[model samples]
Target: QNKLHYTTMIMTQFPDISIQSVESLGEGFRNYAILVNGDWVFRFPKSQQGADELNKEIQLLPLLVGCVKVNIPQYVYIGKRSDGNPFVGYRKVQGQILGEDGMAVFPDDAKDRLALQLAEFMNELSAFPVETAISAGVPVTNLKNKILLLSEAVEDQVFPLLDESLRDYLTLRFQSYMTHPVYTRYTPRLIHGDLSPDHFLTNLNSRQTPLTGIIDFGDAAISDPDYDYVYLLEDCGELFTRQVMAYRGEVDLDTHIRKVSLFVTFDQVSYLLEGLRARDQDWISEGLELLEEDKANNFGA
Candidate 1:
């Protein structure tokens, strides 16, 4: 609380941005988002992950400000209080955040356009040079090595959470891909380590455009580019594929099915375990449901 108090004091030094609200955004992450009354947003963290020195998002934002089409809340300032904890503030962005029920609220027409726009945004984000990844504080190369790291973790933690039938299904699917030339081929770039419907905010009224902003850069890091695509959909292909196809102006059912199934059972399960370690039940529930759903739909069908 003292950290926030000092952060609020520091942020008020700026013009037109009065703090309106302050509260817990979620569990596991120590964040307090300051709802500014004017033209900015502020977030103060209890600690930055020292392992990844690039976790100072406030410092990185200015570097990539113009790279993507969507507005990234511009970093206004970062500072410490009497207790020596860090905090960050940004120029406020406008949009509506969608949760589970809110996603279903979108009309079919709007949902379709939202998917296409998001797909394009991702493709653009992936176009940055490998050197920029170093700027983001990600290891610049050896993406296959990173995925291999993930493979080991999945075998250790994710496998036990599955029922025997689903476990066999997942193991066979992952192993089959391991030897495939395409699966082994990899791209290393800066990726939104976390991308999901939760981070997407949209303008439902816009017909020509949708998805007002993609918020939360806390998980932004250098990683396998495909991992970003996988997490963006998070096995919600019913929503993702339909939109991506319409946006790309083509359909590749096989590609969509393969990526969706692989990500659901492998990537999503690993993510769930990571969340569990952090005591994040929301992702744990979503990941499990989608993992089980993938088993039933892809294997059973």
Candidate 2:
């Protein structure tokens, strides 16, 4: 009901959006995103989804624009449509979501420039001091808390369905990652949160730049820079290698791969076994096997 109220207000302001076809993207405990013909993306937060995130998103988007030289959805308004659907329309950014062939699209030669661009973006994103929701009495991002939350969800939703090997792998790995010293120094940074090929957007303009445009602030938060690097590395492996070469005028492919592999192993097992919906064998069998064998000897195996 409250979400419908928000959507109605947004439509009133941007009548030209034409109320194109709406498709539900998904929902958090609070907010939901709807795509309108892949052009207009609207978000509505249920009363359950706290206003803290909505408010932070609205406040921080403007700041991000100057830092990344990219397009981000600007908050247009908060209200319902004529039909009483709650929603909000920020600006519609034009870009292609980097697909599986993103490496083919950008290629290796582009890595140097891409590295400069991303490093600049990362440096700037971290340069600006951010006020975490924690300071303002909002929920702060905590890996330990997330592990606990996911543990309960896994017990109720996943454990019964998984084999002993997979269950043991997840439980032991999740604890190790949770207790890692690096996790303790989790300084707040303006991370894209979901930085990956699908999330890496590009402008169709003359720039045709890779990672120039960004979206899905749903996961954006104060987090580690390293976590974001793996998304780029996993999708565009050699491009990431080249980027490192450009940044340092040399390459340490092994080091980068190792770091990224760690995140992937931790992140994937956590997602599949906990809150995320069940995928097929891709979630566990193939992925876990690849990660284990890769880590054991790929660097020097």
Candidate 3:
């Protein structure tokens, strides 16, 4: 508590404002998060390495305000703490978090309703100029190498322990995946690497455009634009993924859907691979449990 003398940092950042309250919202792997005076939210980095990511948000979020329809942070303060790690504060972005009750339990119109809004957000986000994003420190991702790293891990660490037929099919699946020309030809764009419910803010009761805001671009990446929708496929369901894809101009919808679905399934195997790499029996078992359906299904299905 003493380490994050947030009041001091706040005073440094905003010399004139009087503090009314400072509430700890909790922290993630890189930053300690706090809600200040019910109007401002601040983040303090935990490590020097996290500075790169914090700086990414600092540099990128400003460019995004004009690019996307949804509301995002416009940093009021971007500065290093007295200790030299980065800290940031922005006026709180307000909207209802699009949780399961608001999404999965949505009315008949809600899927199409929100998907259009969400899909539009994605289009605007990815279609933004890449070189400009690169100038802001967004790093390019190697899709082939990123996927292969996991595939290679499976071959060496996971395949040997799993049953034979499944292993053979996993080989078949990966072979099919790598050989596809679709992987080779793609428009690299900025992607919201994290698209879980909590990060999406919405007005479910709205007459149009239910999705109002998207927060937390900390996981943003420069990669195959399709990678942006994987979280939607995984968390928001296939129909939502399909609906979102359909709204995006209908250019190669089937293959795009298949690729996102395949990666969603592939990610479970990644969980298994992580367990094998760590030799954590529980994670391996959990991975297998998560992977149970994959053994029965094929990629690009």
Candidate 4:
């Protein structure tokens, strides 16, 4: 379905605002986004599940905006079934998305500043009470069970397709996260859940690269406080992870690191599982590289 199909509907609903252009801004597996006139981001669901997730974000972001440090989306227009489709639109968050390449080029001091900024943001976000989140309809995650489920998915869907060494490595990594006692020790908190680089908006123009906003709450949930650290560990390295822990406060650094190390591989494992299921060799190959690098990074830590 073309998203442009809704453009006319949008214009009819809001006659005062003029849209100059529209472009797709890809987000998660089941969602579609359009950048309107280069200033507004309108998100649409590709399926019922995506629509449910979008509704969750729409319901929670307002509750969260006042509690967190970083800028979160303030929805301007929420389209209903009568308005042509179910969609949510907001003013575009500032700054360009930060990537690993950009992080590498950042001067050492810039990286350190970013580490603190992100850590503080996470700390603030974690302060939102779990009870409050649950009351607002945020789903709770049981990590032990989630890991076991994913482990079975890997075994049933991914292992048969992999070479012996890759299979063995992935199996051991999956078992570690599934069986480890460290996962159960933390109290759950409201977390962004998906902190991948694409969702982090950064001010690259500054001498010190600063995180301007955190976007994409479609994956938000009440989970292990450490769950949010996974992408930070994978993308920003140990320095940033440690700094986040320090700011997070009350975290047991060693145990948290072990848990974080394992959490870091789950996304890639799931990607590989999907690739194998769809017989997407290109996606499988990319997932393989991600897993190899993740394994290399956490092997002895």
Q: Which candidate ranks first by TM-score, i.e. highest?
A: 4
Clashes of 1: 1
Cα error of candidate 3 at position 70, Å? 0.8
Per-residue lDDT over 1-301 for candidate 1, one digit per residue giving the tens place of the 0 to 100 score: 6546644576565535455655444322546565555544556664556313325465556666677877766766665545555556666666777754567667778877777777777766677665765655654545556556767776787777767887777667777567667655655667766577767777767787777777666666666555666644553446566567446454565665465456556665666778767787787778778677767667553
Residue 168 CA displacement from its true place in model 3, Å: 3.2
* C-alpha lDDT of candidate 2 relative to the true structure: 0.58
Candidates, ranked, lDDT: 4, 3, 1, 2
Q: What is the C-alpha lDDT of each candidate?
A: 0.63, 0.58, 0.78, 0.78
How much is 107 displaced in model 3, in angstroms? 3.0
Residues forming the 10-long window of minimal summed lDDT in candidate 4 = 79-88
Q: State the lDDT of candidate 2 residue by residue for 29-116, as single tens digits.
A: 5576776666666777665333445666665676666666756677665555344444566655666666657656665445455566
Q: Which candidate is the best by lDDT?
A: 4
- Residue ranges of candidate 1 with Cα displaced over 4 Å: 2-30, 50-56, 81-85, 139-143, 157-162, 245-253, 275-290
Give RMSD (Å) of candidate 3 vs. truth.
2.9
In candidate 2 the C-alpha lDDT for residue 142 amounts to: 65
- What is the Cα root-mean-square deviation between model 1 and the actual structure? 4.0
TM, every model: 0.77, 0.65, 0.86, 0.89
Ranking by TM-score: 4, 3, 1, 2
Candidate 3 residues lying further than 4 Å off, grouped into runs, are 1-8, 11-17, 46-49, 100-102, 272-285, 294-300
Where is the poorest 10-residue window by lDDT in model 2? 132-141
